[PDB]
Amino acid sequence: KYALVGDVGGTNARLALCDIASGEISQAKTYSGLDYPSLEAVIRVYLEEHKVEVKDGCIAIACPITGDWVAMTNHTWAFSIAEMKKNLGFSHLEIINDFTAVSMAIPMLKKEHLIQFGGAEPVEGKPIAVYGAGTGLGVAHLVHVDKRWVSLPGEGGHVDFAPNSEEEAIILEILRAEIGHVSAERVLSGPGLVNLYRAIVKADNRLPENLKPKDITERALADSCTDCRRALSLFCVIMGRFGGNLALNLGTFGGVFIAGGIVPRFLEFFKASGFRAAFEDKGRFKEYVHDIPVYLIVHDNPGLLGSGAHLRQTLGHIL
Amino acid sequence: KYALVGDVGGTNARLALCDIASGEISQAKTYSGLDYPSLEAVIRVYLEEHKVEVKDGCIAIACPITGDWVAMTNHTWAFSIAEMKKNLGFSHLEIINDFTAVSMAIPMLKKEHLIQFGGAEPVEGKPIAVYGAGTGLGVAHLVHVDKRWVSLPGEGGHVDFAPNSEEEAIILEILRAEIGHVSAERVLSGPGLVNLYRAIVKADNRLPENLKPKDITERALADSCTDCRRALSLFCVIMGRFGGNLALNLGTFGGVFIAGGIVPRFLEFFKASGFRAAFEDKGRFKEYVHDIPVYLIVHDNPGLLGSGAHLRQTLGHIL
Ligand SMILES: OC[C@H]1O[C@@H](O)[C@H](O)[C@@H](O)[C@@H]1O
Ligand SMILES: OC[C@H]1O[C@@H](O)[C@H](O)[C@@H](O)[C@@H]1O
């Protein structure tokens, strides 16, 4: 009747139960990864606090899933998938990338979970691209073949940052002299927002403050600091440029989806930003992406919802 | 018994016959688009010099294939797919992008048709990335779902150029002044070799010669112009960076394939260039792409071969 679903990112692990018949998510609880020694220990606690027998599960984790060994870059947890499934006695245990799960949540979303940013209307049967600026920059794609939804994972957040304008080029130069390779995550993320502010200040021959991401948005929203105001606007433009590159690359006439990370915290600024202009700023191919819609997912837990969908399809349910 | 396959790009129009039972290609001929008023005229002309009755066809064309109206924009022809099919009395007439066709040639290629550049071995069932620098920059992706090879076409050659080094950033700066948005096609193509040469010369505060892509390649191999050898060396580096971004974005552990448009004319220079190092210069995710193989396709007619593969799969045959 019920299956276990999870969304683990860095220091937070979120666990919930999923209705096998319908895919509804219920009984969601967030745990702290610092207070538990392993992912397995957290699952043991959840399964007894809720008095539910569970035999199938699917956990989303924010790191590359390649083989049986899962080592978290942000967290210290590391485990073998086949051993956890045996240890917990599960019949199915699916370990997937966090944006693999987010991509799988799209067929479950209603119109009330989306806010459109330009474009006209999706083309049925054409690919879909998903990305989000959160702890890092996650990217995934989704294609419908026959009756199966096929998620295409990857590490698209670590491709080379692609500056277009002179302002964007100046950011690359300051970041390049610090770390070498500058990936898109270094600018399109929570820490990326800090990098934008630091480089904009360093370019003015000044030392940046030790500002946290939430500080930069709040000062930019209050217009109390021009360095932060510039950073936030530059972030919104780079967001559109990244998404427009994805849409061209995979011909995603099914739409481009933004899994809400830090963006919903400055949603009104985002709507008035230059995001949509940057999305279409593609030379002779502005008209190619002009009608492709863009959606922000305001669902409070797409990762849990899409973990259940991925499992149910794996178990033979048609979404 | 036979079906018609075609590969049309720019000025040329290549037509051939395809064995429906086997997928073998034969009786290929290269017509000129300047000497005929339409692609229909070429097909009508070809179908009578070879005296073969044909009902099914697949033509690959180097332009985006969005709807029924097809306009090349690299040629004067433009036509409706539905209208051309009716005129020829075909039952099936598939019209596809030229790198959709190249992507479907991959299942039919043998070891003799591949040259490996680094990486170790492909993982079965993982996505494949295909790209090629010719008159334009083509990109396609290929995934094997159940029994079917699914081609994901796109216009990925028109994404933003992504400079990494200081020398690359200069190229973007100079080209941005001349054309505005700078696509990867502007540096990674036949014409892009000239842009790389010209930006290098203008960066040196000199005036560029009116060279052609043939001039740059031959002068580079002859050590006749240091401007032209630098342009060629930077071409090979950016080729590697671009391919590495493709492998990160879609997790292409099935391999990255480079369709040779201009590469084979300087094959040995390419082998000695910094292509592989550029392919893997991806910060923390060098190890992620380190083992992914890169193959150069040395088949002289992959577009015809893949067009047959696409039509055959559409007709119900298994590849
Ligand atoms: O969490 C979003 C993304 O951040 C990146 O740093 C990770 O490598 C991805 O696996 C993850 O999907
Ligand atoms: O020929 C390779 C590529 O060149 C580009 O200019 C075209 O827009 C693509 O449709 C084509 O696939």
Side-chain angles (χ1 to χ4, degrees):
Chain A
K1 211 212 218 162
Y2 291 107
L4 172 78
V5 292
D7 196 359
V8 190
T11 176
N12 303 125
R14 214 183 248 151
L15 309 175
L17 295 162
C18 164
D19 190 355
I20 284 322
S22 41
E24 321 151 346
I25 306 312
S26 56
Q27 300 251 308
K29 168 124 156 212
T30 300
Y31 298 87
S32 167
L34 301 175
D35 308 359
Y36 294 88
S38 80
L39 182 60
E40 203 201 283
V42 195
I43 293 154
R44 301 263 192 209
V45 165
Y46 184 91
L47 273 179
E48 275 173 32
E49 283 189 19
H50 296 251
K51 295 172 65 176
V52 171
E53 89 84 46
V54 173
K55 192 210 31 153
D56 299 292
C58 178
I59 319 284
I61 305 139
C63 73
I65 305 299
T66 46
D68 188 73
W69 186 251
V70 184
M72 237 170 302
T73 89
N74 277 321
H75 204 7
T76 168
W77 289 347
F79 68 96
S80 154
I81 302 158
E83 90 169 346
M84 250 187 60
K85 160 204 218 151
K86 211 222 154 193
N87 283 340
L88 295 164
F90 284 9
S91 101
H92 300 97
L93 178 64
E94 285 275 313
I95 298 293
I96 57 170
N97 174 264
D98 59 330
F99 268 73
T100 289
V102 167
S103 68
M104 279 304 231
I106 297 189
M108 304 287 125
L109 297 178
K110 300 145 110 210
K111 190 216 274 241
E112 57 172 35
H113 300 136
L114 311 166
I115 303 172
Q116 178 154 0
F117 284 79
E121 95 259 41
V123 180
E124 215 59 89
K126 294 305 205 268
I128 292 166
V130 192
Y131 71 117
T135 322
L137 186 59
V139 179
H141 299 80
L142 179 67
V143 283
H144 199 209
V145 177
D146 262 316
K147 225 63 145 193
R148 194 187 139 208
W149 293 90
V150 183
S151 202
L152 291 151
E155 290 292 311
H158 298 284
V159 302
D160 314 328
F161 170 48
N164 284 77
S165 80
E166 212 217 356
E167 221 168 354
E168 301 167 7
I170 284 153
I171 308 296
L172 175 65
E173 186 178 52
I174 291 154
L175 287 193
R176 180 175 68 234
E178 288 184 32
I179 41 151
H181 180 258
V182 185
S183 83
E185 171 176 290
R186 299 298 200 168
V187 167
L188 278 191
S189 76
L193 190 47
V194 173
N195 287 359
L196 270 199
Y197 156 77
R198 290 187 312 109
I200 280 159
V201 167
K202 278 160 80 153
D204 217 63
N205 235 306
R206 292 182 270 129
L207 311 178
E209 306 190 26
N210 190 36
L211 287 198
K212 279 62 63 173
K214 73 198 218 232
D215 293 289
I216 287 145
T217 60
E218 194 80 342
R219 299 201 182 160
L221 287 190
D223 250 347
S224 83
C225 184
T226 58
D227 308 333
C228 294
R229 186 77 166 203
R230 276 158 116 199
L232 201 57
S233 297
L234 267 87
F235 177 95
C236 291
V237 161
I238 291 181
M239 269 292 269
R241 294 199 198 276
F242 195 79
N245 288 336
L246 300 176
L248 288 158
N249 188 50
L250 257 283
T252 61
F253 300 111
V256 174
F257 283 73
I258 296 165
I262 79 174
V263 168
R265 109 193 308 180
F266 52 97
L267 177 65
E268 284 321 294
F269 181 99
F270 192 75
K271 275 202 130 293
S273 68
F275 163 89
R276 189 56 202 209
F279 179 83
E280 315 194 3
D281 185 27
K282 305 290 173 201
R284 306 161 287 174
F285 276 78
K286 180 208 148 86
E287 73 206 324
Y288 181 98
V289 296
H290 173 76
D291 290 318
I292 296 176
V294 165
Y295 305 102
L296 171 79
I297 306 160
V298 299
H299 195 277
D300 77 297
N301 266 249
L304 294 183
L305 189 71
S307 283
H310 174 95
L311 184 62
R312 291 205 320 138
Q313 182 177 267
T314 278
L315 294 175
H317 301 251
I318 286 179
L319 318 157
Chain B
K1 200 213 140 146
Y2 288 96
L4 176 93
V5 293
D7 178 33
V8 183
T11 80
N12 292 337
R14 206 137 173 170
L15 274 200
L17 281 200
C18 183
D19 195 321
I20 314 271
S22 76
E24 288 186 357
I25 296 316
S26 86
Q27 292 228 264
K29 165 93 209 132
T30 319
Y31 298 79
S32 164
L34 262 46
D35 312 348
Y36 298 78
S38 67
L39 164 68
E40 221 207 307
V42 173
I43 295 157
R44 269 171 186 308
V45 155
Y46 176 91
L47 270 200
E48 292 232 351
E49 328 163 54
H50 294 249
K51 285 309 172 173
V52 297
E53 52 114 348
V54 139
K55 282 262 181 163
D56 297 284
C58 185
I59 314 302
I61 304 150
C63 64
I65 299 328
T66 51
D68 184 67
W69 185 252
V70 181
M72 291 192 235
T73 314
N74 238 38
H75 191 39
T76 187
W77 301 343
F79 64 100
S80 149
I81 299 152
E83 164 103 324
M84 201 184 42
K85 174 183 144 145
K86 275 277 280 263
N87 291 0
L88 305 171
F90 276 5
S91 320
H92 309 89
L93 170 63
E94 289 285 321
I95 301 295
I96 59 178
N97 170 264
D98 61 334
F99 266 67
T100 306
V102 170
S103 78
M104 313 279 332
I106 275 158
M108 314 291 303
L109 292 165
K110 266 126 173 193
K111 184 111 148 54
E112 144 194 37
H113 308 133
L114 301 186
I115 300 173
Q116 188 165 347
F117 296 124
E121 64 304 2
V123 187
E124 217 80 356
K126 299 296 155 172
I128 276 151
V130 202
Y131 74 117
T135 290
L137 179 51
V139 166
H141 288 80
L142 194 69
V143 70
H144 195 193
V145 195
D146 320 316
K147 301 302 154 307
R148 152 144 71 109
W149 291 94
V150 179
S151 179
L152 308 156
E155 294 298 309
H158 301 281
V159 309
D160 310 338
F161 166 55
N164 284 235
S165 79
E166 225 200 343
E167 321 293 292
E168 290 161 5
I170 298 146
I171 308 287
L172 160 69
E173 184 178 328
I174 288 157
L175 265 32
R176 186 198 41 241
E178 289 198 55
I179 55 198
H181 173 261
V182 183
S183 56
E185 182 169 273
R186 299 303 188 192
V187 297
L188 295 186
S189 63
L193 257 182
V194 183
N195 296 327
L196 281 175
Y197 157 78
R198 291 169 344 121
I200 281 174
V201 172
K202 288 165 92 232
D204 211 333
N205 305 303
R206 295 182 279 105
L207 292 173
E209 280 191 87
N210 209 62
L211 302 189
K212 276 332 186 173
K214 244 193 174 139
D215 306 316
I216 300 161
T217 294
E218 253 326 295
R219 283 164 186 236
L221 309 160
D223 228 20
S224 156
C225 215
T226 62
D227 295 327
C228 299
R229 175 178 288 242
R230 286 172 62 202
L232 199 65
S233 316
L234 199 61
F235 177 93
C236 303
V237 163
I238 298 158
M239 266 294 267
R241 298 193 193 282
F242 184 90
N245 289 330
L246 295 176
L248 284 165
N249 187 57
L250 217 70
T252 71
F253 295 105
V256 181
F257 294 75
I258 300 179
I262 70 160
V263 172
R265 284 129 173 151
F266 50 98
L267 175 126
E268 266 289 12
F269 182 97
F270 190 82
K271 267 222 252 213
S273 78
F275 167 86
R276 191 60 208 207
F279 178 86
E280 282 173 48
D281 188 47
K282 304 294 184 198
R284 303 161 283 202
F285 281 73
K286 177 169 145 73
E287 183 205 53
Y288 182 95
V289 305
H290 173 60
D291 274 330
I292 294 183
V294 169
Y295 301 105
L296 170 85
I297 313 182
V298 290
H299 199 307
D300 54 34
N301 281 320
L304 299 173
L305 191 68
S307 277
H310 170 90
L311 183 53
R312 287 182 76 241
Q313 190 169 253
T314 305
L315 283 179
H317 305 240
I318 300 296
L319 307 164

